[PDB]
Design a protein around this ligand. Structure first.
Ligand SMILES: CCCCCCCCCCCCCCCCCC(=O)OC[C@H](COP(=O)([O-])OCC(O)COP(=O)([O-])OC[C@@H](COC(=O)CCCCCCCCCCCCCCCCC)OC(=O)CCCCCCCCCCCCCCCCC)OC(=O)CCCCCCCCCCCCCCCCC
Ligand SMILES: CCCCCCCCCCCCCCCCCC(=O)OC[C@H](COP(=O)(O)OCCN)OC(=O)CCCCCCCCCCCCCCCCC
Ligand SMILES: NC(=O)C1=CN([C@@H]2O[C@H](COP(=O)(O)OP(=O)(O)OC[C@H]3O[C@@H](n4cnc5c(N)ncnc54)[C@H](OP(=O)(O)O)[C@@H]3O)[C@@H](O)[C@H]2O)C=CC1
Ligand SMILES: CCCCCCCCCCCC(=O)OC[C@H](COP(=O)(O)OCC[N+](C)(C)C)OC(=O)CCCCCCCCCCC
Ligand SMILES: CCCCCCCCCCCC(=O)OC[C@H](COP(=O)(O)OCC[N+](C)(C)C)OC(=O)CCCCCCCCCCC
Ligand SMILES: CCCCCCCCCCCC(=O)OC[C@H](COP(=O)(O)OCC[N+](C)(C)C)OC(=O)CCCCCCCCCCC
Ligand SMILES: CCCCCCCCCCCC(=O)OC[C@H](COP(=O)(O)OCC[N+](C)(C)C)OC(=O)CCCCCCCCCCC
Ligand SMILES: CCCCCCCCCCCC(=O)OC[C@H](COP(=O)(O)OCC[N+](C)(C)C)OC(=O)CCCCCCCCCCC
Ligand SMILES: CCCCCCCCCCCC(=O)OC[C@H](COP(=O)(O)OCC[N+](C)(C)C)OC(=O)CCCCCCCCCCC
Ligand SMILES: CCCCCCCCCCCC(=O)OC[C@H](COP(=O)(O)OCC[N+](C)(C)C)OC(=O)CCCCCCCCCCC
Ligand SMILES: CCCCCCCCCCCC(=O)OC[C@H](COP(=O)(O)OCC[N+](C)(C)C)OC(=O)CCCCCCCCCCC
Ligand code: SF4
Lengths: 50, 353, 175, 111, 359, 440
């Protein structure tokens, strides 16, 4: 008899770490890669066809 | 304007990362209070708060909004300093301790080879923040539990500090990422099981959580040191207490249970095998897995904090001081020499790679 | 001077919302009262046989904690004061000191016969005949002792009053 | 020298917290049991036909009041919460024009 | 008070009602009256209401704040203190509090106009509606409270409207109405003293140079009580004030010296010399930005006007009461805000007062 | 004196003090400035030290404390954390019960006894019922005395759950408090089915009981008995063998058996000290002789011993409940004398003799023959007794009540002296204080 009601707060706490980890990992990785694309903003943000 | 907007986010993105980070900790902290009553409810055949928000989810916010909007008791008309320094120092001390906890590979706001010292140093400030609470604000119940309080979280800060250093001795590093990443082939719960118990016992006593809860001895000191505190001073201090319960739960998972490392690498690679590494969707899922791996481990101790509170009576204060000094200290001072002896005997003195 | 007060403008508890501000300050009142409606933290002022029922509400059968009720010992941390049991003369001065220390807002619930009007000991040389001679009361729970549900019913009725608070609209319309 | 459990046996129970861990497990058993809580006011607890609650004055099916003003009521009441004053009605049948209960003074005794 | 307030057990009102008081004057006694105390939830009302209820007079207290009327019911017995929700803009609710009333007391009076009322609308518009409505219901006696410096032609808004409040009542209630002028009363949480105890009192030199005749609020509380039970005091004008003359600046340093408040007065903000335009500008700015009643432009003018005794009126001794001096009671009312406590007795206030005047 | 206060080495005679530039007296009028010329050493035991008597830290364990079972101003004088002197201030709940009983009949005075102890109701009114029965010289029939034995045990379970678990809760174990309170809710159902009110059951009246047991009550009482047996086991799981529970209580509040008699302690705090005395055995009453049960006796006289005795009182009480259900006899439930018991309503409206006694019972009451009595019973706290003087009137003349919690609280100074402030809570908990009973 697993009380699912008591597990509701832990799911949000589980999502509490996920929001920090999900945003920090994706944002920091995205920005670092973007700044290595070139010496200028005209090429950092413009996705190349070639 | 799209040229002045896309570069505008480039000027504000890292602030939002912190705000996303800040909300991440507070959500866990806010819902630890809700999770405590629920977990301590069913264990006692109660039900816990289920009638404040849908299934009781909006229970912490009700208490925060209720307390923040009460009259504040002050010694004089403009005497706010005394009833604010104690809660503020305690809150900032544990809020700054989150600058080092890594959510993944290098996903920490502060990364330095002195993370452990910074983490332990910030713990000391909160200790000094608490003793201010019971100071000079008359003398009825707060000053009774301030020599008692100070003599408790001073003594166990020795045992807690030694345990941290013994782990750092095994990896020869004071960087939390190195400590986490060095547990790939082994989790220090296996070799250092006694230390995990000793760490958790010291983790409980430092935060003043029961059974070592003579600071706010409810049957003895009414509300303990918070009997004067009301409204916002209570919220800040109460929020300070639970951030430690989250932090000390997380630290136990970081040191002894490998931190964000997956339970199984086979399952971990299968899930990450489904997302193309050239799309940012991979790195959103990756952060969720590693943080979720840390969250489940940190959940079990946050569950354990409530679990121990619902099954163990309070410990007499005089036996607390005679415990760490007579029992925990000699053991923690013995494994601090047992560890180097074994490592050197088999020629395995650790290095930082 | 020049003055002209209308006559058909109604009282606050009957005045409907007219403009958008009357909806703004009603939002603040409901949001603020909802916080106090849910985080209902009385004070453990059990004095006599009525105190047994006040414990049985916290018991697993009724579980006051599910409604957001967490008894707080200190008056500062408690916004309600359930006066349960006989209030003797030897206690009445002490009761006033405990009541006056509750920060506003503050409510008092009188549970049982002794707290209401004297009860069994109404003709006693050392029993206050009703605690209403000492502290203002917002709801009276009748019984000897009131059943654990009767107290919950008394709590609910007081909650229904708190949700009717209109303080921040009163500033806009009645002040 | 007269202890059954050897020094190592007592130390392992002492150092490894044998009884506390057993105490924790038994508490965890109750975590997987159905709580006793009922949901007031959507549900009520049981009541018995002898339950003593709100005083009430009954009435005959024919409509005439059952009460004939004994003052047996005013005499038994341990808290003296019953106040009765009576006289001859207009029809002459003995009834009462005053019947007050001080529910703040009553003890719900049942007399 | 003593043991029984009424002079005679049977009193006939101006309306022919024959009221018989019962009991020996306790909480469970009665007097057969019904004194509607408008504005009873205020500072002055909580004294007027308290004395009336304890002696058995039914009190109908019309309120607009719901959470402030709860504490007024402690004073009376069951049914003695009654409540009516009302607003001065709701005429029907006014007539609910006067239908059964044999005594009607008016205490409503403001110093700061709000976003719903002006100074005239309260000291006149409320008073005019209250007085005229009471007459139509056969109210035997009306008692009114105005400023201590009522003047129809005064340039101060408070004094000008309060004076017109005296005229408009007597053109509405008629010859039976009475007017009582109280000097600044001092009591627990007295608005007269709350300005003196405040540490950050901008323009402290300007505000506190005004002169007054302080009166103990309990005596004024009994002053209305004496008038209430007597019909001989209709159509009069009463000014109530204390014998020994005191000034705010004399009190402010006297107050501070008891609290013992070297460098601190120069730093915490006790003395804030600010330009006269700045004080006028600051009060105007807050008047649209504040949400709680602050220092007003009107009290900037009143600070230049000293209290004036009117000889056409009648003193305390007209009612048989000797007024009490601020010297015998100033210490206890600031005792909350103060090795071995030094209790500044009645005579020793002069010796404190001596120490303030000495340069 | 009242506000302030003021040897081994030989008293050495030294006179003729001189320096190199004169005598002591030549520079006497100048040497006060010279701190190195003083002639009064500060290490001397006779050196005049005048220090004010600053009173010791006197915390008020006052009414607004969760540990208090009522309103107790326990004036504790402590230096450091030890306990020097304790002066409990009872009376904050003196309702004046003994004064009110003198003006009410013997039937109207029964509901006063349920309000003495909030948890042990049917035992409280049993001692006044026995007192009146002893004076009335009338004996309850068999089935009446079995109902009082069964509800004597159920009451003991109800009282001990309040006593033991709050004692466990006041130490800090919150969980056993809530597990047991569900059983109290389950046990209070039995009170409400027979009498009507959950707590204050004016059921045991002088001359038997109030009304017969409802049908099927035995089935529901017995069914709880099977389930209840496990409830103690889990209670003993988190308390009995736990080392933290042992530390808080072992050696705390030591009471010698010889000294326990001196202060007149009774109940658990007399068998905790080793004396094997029990009132149910010394003076059998109300079908207690018929049943069999084992009393518990400690050996160390401390809180942990009294805990074991109280836990044993659970199982022994449950043992009797099985016997009372099994051995239940048939017959009446109250004495068949219309002068001391109301007649049945089927017969009140049919028989002229029945109606007269119903009318006479409730207006004048029955008269108790003159005499005096002191009947003591084993209350869950201890020896509870009433001293009742009969003046031939339908109202008792003197009704003095011996409260077991009253005498125990007096021995607080003897017990708590030399312990620490946390041990004050343990000592109060093991005394099983209910200040309604203390201040009767
Ligand atoms: C194991 C897998 C069980 C399982 O997952 O399915 C059963 C479980 C449902 O339990 P159930 O249908 O009531 O079981 C049948 C009887 O009712 C069960 O009632 P019962 O009384 O007949 O049987 C009780 C059974 C307990 O039943 C179990 O075996 C559960 C075991 C879980 C142990 C976890 C550790 O035995 C016990 O009581 C064992 C207690 C002692 C365990 C001590 C712990 C040692 C470790 O399924 C669920 O997991 C659903 C609940 C959780 C949903 C997850 C999402 C919740 C909301 C999140 C927010 C979004
Ligand atoms: C985190 C890292 C892990 C840290 C923990 C490591 C876990 C392993 C712990 C290793 C060290 C523990 C030593 C235990 C081995 C010796 C224990 C023992 O033999 O008992 C002590 C013994 C007492 O003799 P006794 O058993 O009482 O005989 C009479 C019985 N009635 O006394 C004796 O006579 C022999 C004593 C031998 C002394 C050398 C050892
Ligand atoms: N020592 C003193 O206090 C002084 C006495 N006076 C005058 O004596 C009179 C008594 O007033 P006091 O009690 O001392 O001080 P308060 O200002 O506190 O009294 C105000 C009373 O009248 C009510 N009131 C004000 N405006 C309104 C309004 N628009 N509608 C309804 N009610 C209103 C208030 O209602 P509520 O509070 O419930 O919102 C309150 O009941 C006043 O006129 C005062 O100016 C003269 C100088 C100083
Ligand atoms: C993995 C997985 O499927 O986990 C499901 C997850 C996490 O579950 P949780 O409620 O955080 O578990 C709490 C952790 N305990 C149960 C170990 C204490 O659920 C959600 O993220 C929704
Ligand atoms: C995050 C979402 C949580 C929803 C919880 C909820 O909807 O909360 C319910 C709220 C709060 O009142 P309550 O007493 O908890 O109402 C439920 C009564 N229960 C607990 C007895 C079942 O009521 C309402 O629905 C009215 C307002 C709408 C919801 C406001 C929630 C806060 C804003 C969230 C979006 C900005
Ligand atoms: C003592 C409990 C140990 C524990 O919780 O172990 C959990 C166990 C074993 O993991 P482990 O060998 O202890 O460390 C983990 C070592 N990896 C990183 C190589 C897997 O997880 C499972 O494989 C499930
Ligand atoms: C082989 C391995 C085992 C050897 C066992 C020897 C036991 C010695 C003993 O117990 O020594 C006994 C003595 C004297 O005891 P006492 O209380 O003065 O008198 C005893 C009782 N009487 C009066 C009845 C006789 O105490 C000591 O000096 C204790 C030393 C404590 C050291 C704590 C620090 C340890 C840190 C560990 C490494 C970092
Ligand atoms: C983030 C903020 C989310 C707020 C959630 C709480 C909702 C609330 O407080 O709603 C309560 C209030 C007021 O009650 P009402 O039912 O609208 O009263 C009006 C009753 N009429 C319509 C029948 C006359 O609603 C509002 O003012 C709605 C606007 C705010 C959203
Ligand atoms: C950022 C700040 C922190 C979060 C703020 C939110 C905290 C919780 C708020 C509690 C609200 C509350 O209590 O609303 C619930 C109360 C309870 O109804 P009642 O009191 O009986 O009146 C209601 C009955 N009438 C008016 C007839 C007398 O009103 C309401 O049903 C409000 C109406 C429902 C609003 C739904 C639309 C708005 C949705 C807004 C969310 C997206
Ligand atoms: C080499 C082996 C390494 C082992 C490392 C771990 C050691 C831990 C401490 C052992 C000694 C001890 O707990 O001692 C018990 C001490 C001191 O007891 P004492 O004064 O001696 O009284 C006993 C006298 N006897 C010997 C006669 C029996 O007090 C206590 O009850 C402390 C209770 C601590 C509870 C913490 C709960 C946390 C739970 C964490 C998981 C949910
Ligand atoms: C923080 C800013 C506070 C704004 C106060 C305000 O907007 O107040 C402005 C005025 C003043 O009215 P008041 O403050 O009640 O006047 C009484 C108080 N005095 C005497 C001190 C002035 O009112 C309004 O037009 C209210 C409109 C509602 C605006 C939304 C809030
Ligand atoms: S009302 Fe009844 S139950 Fe409550 S304290 Fe008084 S006598 Fe006891």
């Amino acid at each position: 008899m697993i009380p699912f009601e008591a597990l509701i707060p832990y799911a949000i706490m589980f999502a509490g770490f996920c929001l920090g980890g999900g945003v920090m990992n994706s944002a920091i990785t995205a920005d670092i890669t973007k700044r290595a694309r070139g010496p200028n903003q005209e090429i950092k943000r413009n996705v190349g066809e070639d | 304007m799209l040229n002045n907007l896309f570069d505008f986010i480039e000027y504000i993105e890292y602030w939002l990362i912190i705000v996303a980070f800040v909300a991440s900790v507070l959500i866990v902290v806010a819902y630890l209070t809700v999770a405590e009553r629920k977990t301590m409810g069913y264990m006692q055949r109660r039900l816990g708060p289920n009638a404040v928000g849908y299934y009781g989810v909006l229970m912490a916010v009700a208490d925060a909004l209720k307390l923040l909007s009460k009259e504040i008791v002050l010694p004089h008309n403009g005497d706010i300093i005394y009833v604010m320094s104690g809660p503020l120092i305690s809150l900032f001390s544990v809020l700054l301790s989150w600058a080092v906890i890594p959510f993944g590979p290098g996903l920490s706001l502060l990364d330095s080879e002195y993370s452990i010292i910074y983490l332990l140093a910030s713990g000391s400030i909160g200790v000094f923040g608490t003793v201010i609470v019971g100071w000079m604000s008359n003398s009825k119940y707060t000053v009774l539990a301030t020599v008692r309080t100070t003599a408790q979280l001073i003594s166990y800060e020795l045992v807690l500090t030694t345990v941290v250093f013994i782990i750092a001795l095994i990896v020869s590093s004071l960087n939390i990422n190195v400590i986490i990443e060095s547990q790939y082939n082994i989790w220090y719960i296996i070799p250092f099981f006694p230390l995990c118990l000793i760490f958790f016992i010291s983790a409980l006593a430092e935060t003043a959580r029961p059974p070592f809860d003579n600071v706010e001895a409810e049957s003895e000191l009414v509300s303990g040191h918070m009997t004067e505190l009301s409204a916002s001073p209570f919220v800040i201090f109460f929020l300070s207490e639970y951030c430690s319960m989250v932090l000390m739960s997380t630290l136990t998972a970081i040191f002894f249970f490998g931190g964000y490392l997956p339970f199984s690498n086979t399952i971990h690679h299968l899930i990450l095998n489904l997302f193309d590494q050239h799309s940012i969707y991979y790195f959103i899922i990756e952060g969720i897995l590693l943080s979720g791996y840390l969250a489940i481990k940190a959940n079990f101790f946050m569950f354990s904090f409530v679990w121990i509170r619902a099954a163990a009576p309070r410990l007499r204060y005089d036996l607390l001081i005679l415990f760490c000094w007579y029992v925990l200290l000699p053991i923690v001072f013995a494994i601090v020499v047992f560890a180097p002896g074994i490592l050197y005997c088999f020629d395995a003195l650790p290095v930082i790679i | 001077y020049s003055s002209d007060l209308p006559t058909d403008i109604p009282v606050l508890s009957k005045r409907p919302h007219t403009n958008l501000l009357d909806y703004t300050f009603t939002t603040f009142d409901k949001m603020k009262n909802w916080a106090r409606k849910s985080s209902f933290w009385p004070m453990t002022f059990g004095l006599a046989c009525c105190a047994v029922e006040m414990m049985h509400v916290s018991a697993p059968r009724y579980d006051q904690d599910r409604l957001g009720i967490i008894f707080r010992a200190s008056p500062r941390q408690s916004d309600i004061m359930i006066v349960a049991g006989t209030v003797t003369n030897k206690m009445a001065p002490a009761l006033r000191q405990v009541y006056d220390q509750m920060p506003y807002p503050r409510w008092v619930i009188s549970m049982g016969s002794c707290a209401n009007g004297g009860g069994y000991y109404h003709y006693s040389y050392s029993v206050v005949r009703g605690v209403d001679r000492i502290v203002p009361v917002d709801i009276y729970v009748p019984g000897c002792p009131p059943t654990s549900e009767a107290l919950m019913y008394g709590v609910f009725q007081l909650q229904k009053k708190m949700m009717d608070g209109q303080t921040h609209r009163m500033w806009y319309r009645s002040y | 020298e007269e202890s059954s459990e050897s020094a190592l046996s007592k130390a392992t129970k002492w150092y490894l917290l044998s009884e506390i861990f057993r105490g924790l497990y038994i508490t965890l058993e109750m975590y997987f049991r159905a709580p006793y809580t009922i949901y007031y006011p959507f549900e009520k607890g049981p009541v018995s036909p002898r339950f003593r609650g709100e005083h009430a004055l009954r009435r005959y099916p024919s409509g005439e009041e059952r009460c004939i003003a004994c003052k047996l009521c005013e005499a038994v009441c341990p808290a003296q919460a019953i106040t009765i004053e009576a006289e001859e009605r207009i029809d002459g049948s003995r009834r009462t024009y005053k019947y007050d209960i001080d529910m703040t003074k009553c003890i719900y005794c049942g007399y | 008070v003593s043991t029984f307030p009424l002079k005679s057990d049977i009193n006939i009102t101006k309306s022919g009602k024959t009221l018989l008081s019962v009991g020996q004057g306790g909480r469970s006694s009665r007097t057969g009256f019904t004194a509607t105390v408008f504005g009873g939830t205020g500072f002055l009302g909580r004294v007027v209401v308290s004395k009336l209820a304890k002696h058995g007079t039914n009190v109908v207290v019309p309120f607009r704040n719901d959470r402030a009327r709860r504490q007024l019911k402690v004073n009376g017995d069951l049914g003695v203190v009654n409540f009516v929700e009302f607003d001065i803009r709701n005429l029907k609710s006014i007539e609910d509090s006067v239908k059964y009333s044999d005594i009607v007391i008016n205490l409503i009076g403001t110093e700061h106009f709000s976003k719903n009322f002006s100074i005239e609308d309260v000291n006149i518009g409320a008073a005019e509606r209250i007085a005229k409505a009471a007459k139509e219901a056969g109210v035997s006696r009306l008692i009114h409270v105005s400023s201590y410096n009522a003047n129809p032609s005064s340039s101060s808004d408070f004094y000008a409207t309060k004076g017109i409040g005296e005229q408009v009542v007597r053109d509405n209630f008629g010859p039976d109405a009475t007017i009582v002028r109280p000097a600044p009363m001092y009591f627990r949480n007295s608005p007269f003293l709350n300005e003196l105890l405040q540490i950050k009192a901008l323009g402290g030199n300007v505000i506190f140079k005004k002169e007054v005749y302080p009166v103990h609020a309990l005596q004024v509380g009994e002053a209305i009580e004496r008038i209430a039970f007597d019909d001989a005091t209709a159509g009069q004008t009463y000014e109530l004030f204390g014998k020994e003359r005191y000034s705010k600046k004399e009190l402010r340093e006297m107050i501070k010296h008891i609290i013992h408040i070297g460098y601190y007065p120069y730093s915490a903000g006790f003395y804030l010399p600010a330009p006269e335009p700045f004080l006028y500008a600051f009060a105007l700015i807050r008047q649209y930005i504040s949400s709680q009643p602050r220092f007003n432009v009107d009290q900037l003018k009143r600070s230049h006007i000293n209290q004036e005794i009117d000889q056409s009126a009648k003193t305390f001794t007209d009612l048989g009461m000797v007024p009490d001096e601020l010297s015998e009671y100033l210490y206890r009312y600031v005792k909350p805000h103060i090795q071995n406590r030094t209790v500044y007795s009645k005579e020793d206030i002069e010796k404190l007062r001596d120490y303030v005047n000495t340069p | 004196n009242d506000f302030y206060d003021v040897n081994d080495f030989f008293p050495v005679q030294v006179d003729g003090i001189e320096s190199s530039l004169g005598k002591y007296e030549e520079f006497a009028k100048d040497a006060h400035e010279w701190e190195s010329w003083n002639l009064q050493n500060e290490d001397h035991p006779e050196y005049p030290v005048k220090r004010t008597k600053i009173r010791h830290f006197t915390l008020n364990f006052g009414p607004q404390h969760p540990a208090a079972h009522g309103v107790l101003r326990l004036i504790l004088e402590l230096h450091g954390e030890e306990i020097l002197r304790s002066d409990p201030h009872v009376g904050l709940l003196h309702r004046g019960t003994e004064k009110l009983i003198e003006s009410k009949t013997y039937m109207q005075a029964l509901p006063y006894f349920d309000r003495l102890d909030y948890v042990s109701m049917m035992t409280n009114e049993q001692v006044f019922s026995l007192a009146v029965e002893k004076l009335l010289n009338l004996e309850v029939p068999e089935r009446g005395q079995y109902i009082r034995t069964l509800f004597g045990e159920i009451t003991r379970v109800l009282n001990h759950l309040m006593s033991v678990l709050s004692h466990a809760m006041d130490v800090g174990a919150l969980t056993p408090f809530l597990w047991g309170f569900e059983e109290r809710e389950k046990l209070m159902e039995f009170y409400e089915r027979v009498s009507g009110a959950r707590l204050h059951s004016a059921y045991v009246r002088p001359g038997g009981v109030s009304q017969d047991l409802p049908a099927g009550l035995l089935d529901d009482i017995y069914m709880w008995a099977t389930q209840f047996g496990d409830r103690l086991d889990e209670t003993e799981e988190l308390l009995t063998d736990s080392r933290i529970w042992k530390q808080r209580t072992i050696g705390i509040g030591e009471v010698t058996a010889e000294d326990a008699l001196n202060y007149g302690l009774s109940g658990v705090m007399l068998r905790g000290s080793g004396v094997p005395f029990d009132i149910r055995k010394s003076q059998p009453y109300d079908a207690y002789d018929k049943v069999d049960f084992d009393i518990a006796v400690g050996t160390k006289g401390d809180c942990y011993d009294r805990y074991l005795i109280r836990m044993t009182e659970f199982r022994q009480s449950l043992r009797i409940i099985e016997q009372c259900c099994n051995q239940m006899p048939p017959g009446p439930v109250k004495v068949e004398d219309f002068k001391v018991a109301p007649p049945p309503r089927a017969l009140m409206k049919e028989d002229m003799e029945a109606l007269i006694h119903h009318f006479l019972l409730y207006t004048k009451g029955y008269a108790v023959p003159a005499g005096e009595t002191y009947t003591a019973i084993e209350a869950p706290k201890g020896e509870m007794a009433v001293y009742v003087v009969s003046d031939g009137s339908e109202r008792p003349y003197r009704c003095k009540i011996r409260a077991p919690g009253f005498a125990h609280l007096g021995a607080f100074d003897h017990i708590a002296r030399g312990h620490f402030l946390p041990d004050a809570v343990a000592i109060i908990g093991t005394m099983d204080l209910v200040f309604g009973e203390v201040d009767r």
